[PDB]
Amino acid sequence: HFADLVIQVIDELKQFGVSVKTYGAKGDGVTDDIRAFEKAIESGFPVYVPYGTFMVSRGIKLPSNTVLTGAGKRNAVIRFMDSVGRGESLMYNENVTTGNENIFLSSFTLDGNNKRL
């Protein structure tokens, strides 16, 4: 509970923008973090992905005016879960038909977990 209060302060500082962990991401190689990504991305703030393997049960959709930056390749890693079915890219812009604008993506690994199939 003390640590949670300290974390709350850090998160309010927004040193990188907003961390996905602020919205509940675990980045533990097991937990489904898709909702945290969606929440962070819809918040309007630049989004930061810190160290971890962030498991996702569906594709991460990017709206216009998105800044998504990680701690780096093989540091911030985004990965499809074993149970994901067919049909989606791991990461793609929201409006598939007429598109989006101003998307800035930096410094992370995308692991499509093709192995699972």
Q: Does residue 113 interact with a copy of itself by CB under 8 A? A: no
Rounded CA gap, 26 and 46, in Å?
19
DSSP code for 40: H
Residue 25 vs 84, nearer CB to a copy of itself? 25
Is the separation of the CB atoms in 70 and 48 below 8 Å? yes
Rounded CA gap, 51 and 99, in Å?
30
Q: Does residue 51 interact with a copy of itself by CB under 8 A? A: yes
Q: Does residue 106 interact with a copy of itself by CB under 8 A? A: yes
Dihedrals phi, psi of 111, to nearest 5 degrees: -110, 105
Q: Which residue in 25, 40, 52, 62 binds a copy of itself (CB under 8 A)?
A: 52
Binding positions for a copy of itself, rule: CB under 8 A: 1-3, 5-7, 9-10, 12-19, 21, 45-46, 50-52, 65, 67, 69, 71-75, 102, 104, 106
